[PDB]
């Protein structure tokens, strides 16, 4: 993730904005664009408070070797909004009994954590 091609090559622009550009602002300037539900949540969230979580993310991003994935970071904050600061990390996303483990691709942006950890079970009529 630094140099010509190397690693890079998945692209993704969010809202006309590029991930190069995305990864470089302030979460401020990201929510500014377009997302509207996620942005209100973080403003109102605010004061904001998943503080420690975000430090837990960067921490394990560091301690991860130099090639790949690493260990993950757990949470119950289903209502959290995915913002470029997060992308590339690994989130243990609780659903009531299980923590599903999910890498956050840049596409997810603006989505809520909960949308990637299914609570319910499909079901059954015959079987």
């Amino acid at each position: 993730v630094e140099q010509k091609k190397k690693r890079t090559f998945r692209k993704f622009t969010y809202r006309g904005v590029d991930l190069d550009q995305l990864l470089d602002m302030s979460y401020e300037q990201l929510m500014q664009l377009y997302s509207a539900r996620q942005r209100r949540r973080l403003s109102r969230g605010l004061r904001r408070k998943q503080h420690s979580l975000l430090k837990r993310l960067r921490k394990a991003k560091k301690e991860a070797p130099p090639m790949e994935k690493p260990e993950v970071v757990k949470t119950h904050l289903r209502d959290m909004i995915i913002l470029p600061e997060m992308v590339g990390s690994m989130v243990g996303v609780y659903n009531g009994k299980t923590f599903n483990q999910v890498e956050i691709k840049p596409e997810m942006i603006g989505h809520y954590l909960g949308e990637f950890s299914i609570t319910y079970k499909p079901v059954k009529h015959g079987r």
């Binding site: 622009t13 809202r15 006309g16 989505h111 949308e115 990637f116 609570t119 319910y120």
Partner: protein, 137 residues
């Protein structure tokens, strides 16, 4: 008075000509009634008539407005795809292209494995609705 066409094609859909333009257009995927009504008003047509009537001229004029609506005093709120995301558009998807983007969007959140995606994949529901008693047949 006069005649002609019955049966005219715009951008990849066959549009019955007998029919009134506003209504006639609404065959095209992505042209609903509020759409087609405002597009035509923009496009200068005697509202009073049948799609089969009118000129090749007026037709391109409808299409041109239809795929650049913003550029014609059509507000964005009137539009199908605001806020793209992938490009941060605004847009108004049209024709064959609506089926396309529908597919994309479903794929997107199926790749990401989000519960909605999963729901679409099994062919259940994604808005919060009870699944115990209905949509059974």
């Amino acid at each position: 008075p006069e005649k002609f066409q019955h049966i005219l094609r715009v951008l990849n859909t066959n549009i019955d000509g007998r029919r009134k333009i506003a209504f006639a257009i609404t065959a095209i995927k992505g042209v609903g009634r509020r759409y087609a009504h405002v597009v035509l008003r923009k496009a200068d047509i005697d509202l009073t008539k049948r799609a089969g009537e009118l000129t090749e001229d007026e037709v391109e004029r409808v299409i041109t407005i239809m795929q650049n609506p913003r550029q014609y005093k059509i507000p964005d709120w009137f539009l199908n795809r605001q806020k793209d995301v992938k490009d941060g558009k605004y847009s108004q998807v049209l024709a064959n292209g609506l089926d396309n983007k529908l597919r994309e969007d479903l794929e997107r959140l199926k790749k990401i494995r989000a519960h909605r995606g999963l729901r679409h994949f099994w062919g259940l529901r994604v808005r919060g609705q009870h699944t115990k008693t209905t949509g059974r047949r």
